[PDB]
Design an enzyme around this catalytic site. Structure first.
Site, mmCIF file in Angstrom:
data_model
loop_
_atom_site.group_PDB
_atom_site.id
_atom_site.type_symbol
_atom_site.label_atom_id
_atom_site.label_comp_id
_atom_site.label_asym_id
_atom_site.label_seq_id
_atom_site.Cartn_x
_atom_site.Cartn_y
_atom_site.Cartn_z
ATOM 1 N N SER A 140 -6.216 -17.524 43.120
ATOM 2 C CA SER A 140 -5.403 -17.570 44.332
ATOM 3 C C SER A 140 -6.244 -17.120 45.516
ATOM 4 O O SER A 140 -7.026 -16.184 45.376
ATOM 5 C CB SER A 140 -4.212 -16.616 44.188
ATOM 6 O OG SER A 140 -3.505 -16.505 45.416
ATOM 7 N N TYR A 153 0.041 -9.108 41.695
ATOM 8 C CA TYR A 153 -0.451 -10.471 41.564
ATOM 9 C C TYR A 153 -1.875 -10.596 42.117
ATOM 10 O O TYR A 153 -2.743 -11.187 41.476
ATOM 11 C CB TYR A 153 0.502 -11.390 42.311
ATOM 12 C CG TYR A 153 0.110 -12.840 42.398
ATOM 13 C CD1 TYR A 153 0.560 -13.763 41.458
ATOM 14 C CD2 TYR A 153 -0.666 -13.300 43.453
ATOM 15 C CE1 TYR A 153 0.226 -15.099 41.557
ATOM 16 C CE2 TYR A 153 -0.999 -14.640 43.568
ATOM 17 C CZ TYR A 153 -0.550 -15.533 42.615
ATOM 18 O OH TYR A 153 -0.883 -16.864 42.721
HETATM 19 N N1 LIG Z 1 1.903 -22.427 44.581
HETATM 20 C C1 LIG Z 1 1.084 -21.614 45.253
HETATM 21 O O1 LIG Z 1 1.267 -21.281 46.599
HETATM 22 C C2 LIG Z 1 -0.092 -21.002 44.580
HETATM 23 C C3 LIG Z 1 -1.061 -20.393 45.365
HETATM 24 C C4 LIG Z 1 -2.143 -19.786 44.750
HETATM 25 C C5 LIG Z 1 -2.225 -19.796 43.363
HETATM 26 N N2 LIG Z 1 -1.251 -20.389 42.609
HETATM 27 C C6 LIG Z 1 -1.385 -20.392 41.147
HETATM 28 O O2 LIG Z 1 -1.169 -21.694 40.643
HETATM 29 C C7 LIG Z 1 -0.644 -21.622 39.327
HETATM 30 C C8 LIG Z 1 0.660 -22.406 39.252
HETATM 31 O O3 LIG Z 1 1.452 -21.972 40.334
HETATM 32 P P1 LIG Z 1 2.773 -22.779 40.755
HETATM 33 O O4 LIG Z 1 3.039 -22.501 42.181
HETATM 34 O O5 LIG Z 1 2.635 -24.161 40.274
HETATM 35 O O6 LIG Z 1 3.893 -21.976 39.915
HETATM 36 P P2 LIG Z 1 5.315 -22.515 39.364
HETATM 37 O O7 LIG Z 1 6.246 -21.356 39.307
HETATM 38 O O8 LIG Z 1 5.886 -23.671 40.091
HETATM 39 O O9 LIG Z 1 4.929 -22.895 37.863
HETATM 40 C C9 LIG Z 1 4.403 -21.891 37.035
HETATM 41 C C10 LIG Z 1 4.652 -22.331 35.606
HETATM 42 O O10 LIG Z 1 4.080 -21.374 34.740
HETATM 43 C C11 LIG Z 1 5.017 -21.104 33.725
HETATM 44 N N3 LIG Z 1 4.863 -19.780 33.116
HETATM 45 C C12 LIG Z 1 5.216 -18.560 33.637
HETATM 46 N N4 LIG Z 1 4.920 -17.613 32.716
HETATM 47 C C13 LIG Z 1 4.383 -18.215 31.627
HETATM 48 C C14 LIG Z 1 3.910 -17.726 30.417
HETATM 49 N N5 LIG Z 1 4.180 -16.472 30.051
HETATM 50 N N6 LIG Z 1 3.416 -18.609 29.486
HETATM 51 C C15 LIG Z 1 3.385 -19.963 29.755
HETATM 52 N N7 LIG Z 1 3.867 -20.445 30.955
HETATM 53 C C16 LIG Z 1 4.349 -19.580 31.872
HETATM 54 C C17 LIG Z 1 6.389 -21.242 34.366
HETATM 55 O O11 LIG Z 1 7.389 -21.502 33.394
HETATM 56 C C18 LIG Z 1 6.152 -22.389 35.321
HETATM 57 O O12 LIG Z 1 6.493 -23.620 34.714
HETATM 58 C C19 LIG Z 1 -0.433 -20.142 39.049
HETATM 59 O O13 LIG Z 1 -1.606 -19.661 38.423
HETATM 60 C C20 LIG Z 1 -0.343 -19.545 40.434
HETATM 61 O O14 LIG Z 1 -0.676 -18.174 40.420
HETATM 62 C C21 LIG Z 1 -0.185 -21.000 43.199
#
Ligand SMILES: NC(=O)c1ccc[n+]([C@@H]2O[C@H](COP(=O)([O-])OP(=O)(O)OC[C@H]3O[C@@H](n4cnc5c(N)ncnc54)[C@H](O)[C@@H]3O)[C@@H](O)[C@H]2O)c1
Ligand SMILES: NC(=O)c1ccc[n+]([C@@H]2O[C@H](COP(=O)([O-])OP(=O)(O)OC[C@H]3O[C@@H](n4cnc5c(N)ncnc54)[C@H](O)[C@@H]3O)[C@@H](O)[C@H]2O)c1
Ligand SMILES: NC(=O)c1ccc[n+]([C@@H]2O[C@H](COP(=O)([O-])OP(=O)(O)OC[C@H]3O[C@@H](n4cnc5c(N)ncnc54)[C@H](O)[C@@H]3O)[C@@H](O)[C@H]2O)c1
Ligand SMILES: NC(=O)c1ccc[n+]([C@@H]2O[C@H](COP(=O)([O-])OP(=O)(O)OC[C@H]3O[C@@H](n4cnc5c(N)ncnc54)[C@H](O)[C@@H]3O)[C@@H](O)[C@H]2O)c1
EC number: 1.1.1.107
Lengths: 247, 247, 247, 247
Positions: A140, A153
């Site tokens: 992130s 986080y």
């Molecule tokens: N969306 C953003 O602004 C953003 C920014 C920086 C980093 N990220 C990173 O991108 C990745 C995905 O983010 P996103 O926004 O798509 O999130 P999201 O919430 O839309 O999806 C996350 C998915 O991970 C799954 N999950 C949660 N805990 C889990 C576990 N214990 N085992 C298996 N699956 C699990 C959830 O069920 C969900 O389907 C993450 O690593 C997040 O930290 C996202």
């Protein structure tokens, strides 16, 4: 075109958002893709939206037993992954004063330790199969920015970057590379349903580039990192945020 | 597909080494490549080697008039560049006590100021043609490592990175991105011809993966940065060095 | 007094702003301070403001001859510097489309090449006197932020950082360290008198801590870097900006 | 010198090594120092060794109850801390294939989660009193280097850096700063007793400066970060390693 034909990729947290988009892109590149998520129903929907190249196998990345069974089924189906995408994480919005030990342990357990459990089993599988693998972990850009309302986080994602740097050193001898991607704010389902959704106006103004970040913006970069074009890159972190921070 | 079909790319310093490989790769990607170098004969041979997709135009990047002519001809023949790769530089091996003002100015003038001269004209050309553009500048991982025997060079490459970060901020509104690549030690013609050729032992010792870096290692990454897959990346630096340092 | 007693520190561009504050603090620390500036009368006034421990010597850091005379005079007065603070620079406010080659050369010539000229002569003076030495160069957090309206400046400051990293490698053997400081926006004489004065609202919003940065904020860190407490630090960049960016 | 007169500082892991040195230096600066360690007898001996205003209170930083007791006693004795130095950690040597879940959880738990536990309680204490505090956490340059044989440790320390960057943002409003220090290899008692002791030859050769790092090299930098001279620095990481890596 089909540069990944004959490769197998596991994407965790691929039921929705960035993970689903990553999974879809790798399938488009030609890979056999394992769509994994703690949300079983979501994982099935995601694999179905992608098509015949994708199979849903549910797993909780923080549960060592769950992960073991996941990789056992993958070994049975494909002979072992070539590509690991550590995408699963909880993305919380918690005011600093609401960050207690329970919350801290929860985020560290899934986001950081879960990443280790999955990477342990996955790179072990790569090495047993004699495959020259690629580990790509989603961190992130909050690690660079010090973004508020997600203290545990940000710590966890810093752990992921540290882990990636150490892992690259440990695994280079086995022809495995390890890199991280730092997305900026992305309009995923998870962000849309979170208080973070409210940050888009501010973030977009800070970006050099216009528009809300999309899951595809990250998927297309992970595609590169999974390909032979990135073969000389290891231990590195690629920041993908339309210029919000500079790395 | 040929993802760069219909696009025009300028690669400076493309007579040999990393520049030639970059030019070869972009042409393979389907771009119309302008192969430019101060070495007119070398530029010609490189373009001939690459194919009909490639055109040589000699230019000294440190010479504003030379660069103006360069871009005037590109405009006449193509309607303007879509992609600029700032590759040209002098790569010295000079002990600290031999780094005098004359040497310093020479390196800064070509490696840093030359880069500005080309980027000024190039991005103006993109904007005038109303093209989404990509600027990719080749820096060096010596900026991160603090490598000895090239003080003026390291300084200049720091400048290229700084210029890149500011440029991304200035040009984002015109749908132009700007990123940099930091190669590690690469077995290019120029390196093979200098005392840097004896640095491979020490460098490979520090890499996570063994082997001498090759021009294609860099060319393949530049290909990604030139493509739509990198569209959400701007102001960033991608380190490509088999893990010699960690960025 | 106390701690730099017996030490000679040269501060360039010290007639006003951060340079003056640095000179004042190092004098307070007990050093003999050479106050140098292109503005001869300003240097004299600045020395007088500090007192008995300061001597003013005019110099243009971009002019090799002027710098040579500067160091000849210092050698006579003090036996040679122990501490070099590279503070002189032009801080421009220039819209991208107004950044032409003439402007670019001027900024590079002073901020980057001048920095080289002074450090070349200064570190050569240190070595000839067999003094352990400390080189501290003032860069800018704009290198991290990619701040607009100063493209040539950001390039030059990136140059200063790269130079610092290389110099540390070259000079460690002579027991000379080289570090850099990146101030954020500081309410200096120069900034007060420029359009950057209007940037405080935005910068303050990005800061973790509120308030306009002051010259003393930078002078007090330079004091640390000049002292024995920093003896194990070399090749590093310390960012001093109330948390506007994270390094 | 007496710049910390009237201030109270807690140093965890202070029975020996870097922690004890930090405690000794802050005491010499005039602070009332709480020497805390899980080694209760070692903490006592260290506080008695330092004399001046030093007092010992045992605590396991990974045990929430232990930490609560620690801070209750500090509050009763002193009215609460002004300065927190997070120094306690386990420094392992473990080949990658020996890094299992139990080992991983333990290193994360003490090095990263313990840092949170103490920081949570310590900064709550600062704020209760309305003091403009200082949080200084000891990380490691292994985060920059991707050092082998400590994969969980490198991850933990990346977590500490991330935590630091987020915390700076969260507490700026309460006039508390949060910074990190990344020591290189230091000849602490812990290291002398570790297989890491064997790395001194290689590390010294990679350093720009000569000699084995000492606890005092780090203590003297922490002294600076705890002082008013560092008041405009927050969210930052200072690398102290005689130039082994460049930050
Ligand atoms: N969306 C953003 O602004 C953003 C920014 C920086 C980093 N990220 C990173 O991108 C990745 C995905 O983010 P996103 O926004 O798509 O999130 P999201 O919430 O839309 O999806 C996350 C998915 O991970 C799954 N999950 C949660 N805990 C889990 C576990 N214990 N085992 C298996 N699956 C699990 C959830 O069920 C969900 O389907 C993450 O690593 C997040 O930290 C996202
Ligand atoms: N080879 C490496 O180990 C290495 C490492 C990091 C970065 N780089 C960078 O990669 C780029 C290419 O390096 P290389 O090793 O392939 O170099 P090379 O010496 O093999 O080729 C450099 C080319 O640049 C041309 N050139 C020199 N001055 C010029 C000018 N004024 N105008 C136009 N062209 C000019 C030369 O004629 C030559 O054809 C440079 O930016 C260099 O700094 C190289
Ligand atoms: N003030 C800020 O917000 C800010 C931020 C980051 C970095 N900096 C850096 O701090 C340093 C001082 O900045 P300031 O705001 O105090 O500037 P200032 O304009 O107040 O003072 C700069 C001084 O440098 C002198 N100078 C200019 N050219 C010179 C040359 N050729 N030779 C010798 N002296 C010369 C000027 O005469 C002037 O006295 C500069 O390096 C600047 O880049 C300033
Ligand atoms: N020495 C080095 O080369 C080096 C390099 C980089 C960073 N560091 C960091 O510096 C810090 C101190 O390192 P050191 O070399 O002085 O270590 P050390 O082993 O000499 O001392 C560490 C102290 O921490 C205490 N401790 C261990 N677990 C604890 C816990 N659960 N709760 C409270 N106290 C505990 C130990 O009893 C010991 O007294 C650590 O954070 C380490 O990660 C050390």
């Amino acid at each position: 075109t089909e540069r990944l034909a004959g490769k197998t990729a596991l994407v965790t947290g691929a039921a929705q958002g960035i993970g689903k988009a990553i999974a879809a892109r790798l399938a488009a590149d030609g890979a056999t893709v394992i769509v994994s998520d703690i949300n079983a129903e979501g994982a099935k929907a995601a694999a179905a939206s992608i098509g015949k190249k994708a199979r849903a196998i549910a797993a909780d990345i923080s549960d060592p037993g769950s992960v073991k069974a996941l990789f056992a089924e993958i070994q049975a189906l494909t002979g072992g992954i070539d590509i690991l995408v550590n995408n699963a994480s909880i993305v919380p919005f918690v005011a600093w004063d609401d960050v207690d030990l329970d919350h801290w342990r929860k985020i560290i357990d899934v986001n950081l330790t879960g990443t280790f459990i999955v990477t342990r089993a996955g790179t072990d599988q790569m090495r047993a199969a004699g495959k020259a693998g690629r580990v790509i972990s989603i961190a992130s850009n909050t690690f660079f920015a010090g973004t508020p309302n997600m203290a545990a986080y940000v710590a966890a994602k810093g752990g992921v970057i540290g882990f990636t740097r150490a892992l690259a050193t440990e695994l280079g001898k086995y022809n495995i590379t390890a890199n991280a991607v730092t997305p900026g704010l992305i309009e995923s389902d998870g962000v849309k349903a979170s208080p973070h959704n409210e940050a888009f106006g501010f973030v977009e103004m800070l970006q050099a580039m216009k528009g809300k970040g999309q899951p595809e913006h990250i998927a297309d970069v992970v595609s590169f990192l999974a390909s032979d074009d990135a073969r000389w890159i290891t231990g590195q972190t690629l920041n993908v945020d339309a210029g919000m921070v500079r790395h």
